[PDB]
């Protein structure tokens, strides 16, 4: 964000109906800390959530540790407060080049930003995951692979898994159908994604 929100008005952006790829942000070395509670950071690509909220704010190194559940302090007691139970992940990085009297914090005190680590400003983004309030719509990314024809392969098409030979077909699938089944309730053909073609199994 060209400009981050203040801790007295931390931002809460609601993210839904999209694929959230956390591998670029996870591998990115520009972040100072990336602490996830509950789930390991490498399985978020498989897991899915109903909604995610992004709380964005600027704090100071003397309080950068305070973004965690069950913490006390002026910020934890009167400012951005983390809930008692399961939350998502906290991401933070040093922003001394940009934020080190325009920034103040919560009766009101201002940060003594002197650009000369413990007192430096840090930008914190908290990702809160709602996994039950509604049908789930935010899933992690899933990598595609190439399809090999005329060989016994173990395929997985949009969650339908199996083993068989994938070959070209002349079965006219309608635009809205993804896989077709023969008599006896078994798959006869499927429509590939990314390329929209009809493969017989």
């Amino acid at each position, epitope marked *: 964000a*060209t400009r981050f929100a203040s801790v007295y008005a931390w931002n809460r952006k609601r993210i839904s109906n999209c694929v959230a790829d956390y591998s670029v942000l996870y591998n990115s070395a520009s972040f100072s800390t990336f602490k996830c509670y509950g789930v390991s950071p490498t399985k978020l690509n498989d897991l899915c959530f109903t909604n995610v909220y992004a709380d964005s704010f600027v704090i100071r190194g003397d309080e950068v540790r305070q973004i965690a559940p069950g913490q006390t302090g002026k910020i934890a007691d009167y400012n951005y407060k983390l809930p008692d139970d399961f939350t998502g992940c906290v991401i933070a990085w040093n922003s001394n080049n940009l934020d080190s009297y325009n920034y103040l914090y919560r009766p009101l005190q201002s940060y003594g930003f002197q650009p000369t680590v413990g007192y430096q400003p840090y930008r914190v983004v908290v990702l809160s995951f709602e996994l039950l309030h509604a049908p789930a719509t935010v899933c992690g990314p899933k990598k595609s692979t190439n399809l090999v024809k005329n060989k016994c392969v173990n395929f997985n098409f949009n969650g339908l898994t199996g083993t068989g030979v994938l070959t070209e077909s002349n079965k006219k699938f309608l635009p809205f159908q993804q896989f077709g089944r023969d008599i006896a309730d078994t798959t006869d053909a499927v429509r590939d994604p990314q390329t929209l073609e009809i493969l017989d199994i």
Partner: antibody, heavy 123, light 108 residues
Framework: EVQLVESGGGLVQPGGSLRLSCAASGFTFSSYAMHWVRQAPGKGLEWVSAIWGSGSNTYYADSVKGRFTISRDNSKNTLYLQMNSLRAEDTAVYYC????????????????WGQGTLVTVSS | DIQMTQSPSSLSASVGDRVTITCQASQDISNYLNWYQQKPGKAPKLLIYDASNLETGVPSRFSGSGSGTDFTFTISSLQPEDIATYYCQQHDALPWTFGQGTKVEIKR
């Protein structure tokens, strides 16, 4: 509706003192940061002072550092500006402006800008 | 302090013309700059804050741009009530300084 009705301006001899008032109504005065900005006759804008809610976090422009004192009020919600040791260069129309420096990093600007009060330093 | 060499000092344009007023900076002030419209005898009125976000209650014909140390600022359609003097104010390091100001008048 936000309303910054200004008063307390008038005629002062050089070297005298004067107290300015900037009343507020229609919003939470105690939760906002309040500023003073002046403009010399026919010249550009020049910032004066600022009080960010607390009675200790006061900041002044270099041209008025040490001479001008800013203060506020709870209850009735009004703003004051103590002006001391005036010279001929201090003649300007004084405005009290707003400020939401507390949360908003978007409305960093002066949302309203009162109508201003005239102070003339002359004998 | 931070100095702004806002140029030109004055420019002439006609009704409907596009107006650009440059406002420099000192040290990478990003988007902590505000714009003000002032009419004779009237208090300044916000025009562009954070170099891109238009204020509420302002007609959409007013627009701002720029970031860092250069700020472009763009007027789309001149209206006869838009005659005023415009000021750019740096708002990063303890906002103190204003701009010298440019007088925008209708070419005739």
């Amino acid at each position: 509706e936000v309303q910054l009705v200004e008063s307390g301006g008038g005629l002062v001899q050089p070297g005298g003192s004067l107290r300015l008032s900037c009343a507020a109504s229609g919003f939470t005065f105690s939760s906002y940061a309040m500023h003073w900005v002046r403009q010399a006759p026919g010249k550009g804008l020049e910032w004066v002072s600022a009080i960010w809610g607390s009675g200790s976090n006061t900041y002044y422009a270099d041209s008025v550092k040490g001479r001008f004192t800013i203060s506020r009020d709870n209850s009735k919600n009004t703003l004051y500006l103590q002006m001391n040791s005036l010279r001929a260069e201090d003649t300007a129309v004084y405005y009290c402006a707003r400020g939401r420096d507390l949360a908003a990093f978007t409305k960093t600007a002066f949302d309203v800008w009162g109508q201003g009060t005239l102070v003339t330093v002359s004998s | 302090d931070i100095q702004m060499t806002q140029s030109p000092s004055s420019l002439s344009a006609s009704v409907g013309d596009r107006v650009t007023i440059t406002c420099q900076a000192s040290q990478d002030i990003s988007n902590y700059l505000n714009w003000y419209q002032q009419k004779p005898g009237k208090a300044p009125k916000l025009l562009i804050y954070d170099a891109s976000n238009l204020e509420t209650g302002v007609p959409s014909r007013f627009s701002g741009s720029g970031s860092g140390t250069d700020f472009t600022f763009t007027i789309s359609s001149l209206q006869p009530e838009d005659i005023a003097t415009y000021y750019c104010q740096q708002h990063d390091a303890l906002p103190w300084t204003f701009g010298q100001g440019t007088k925008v008048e209708i070419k005739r």
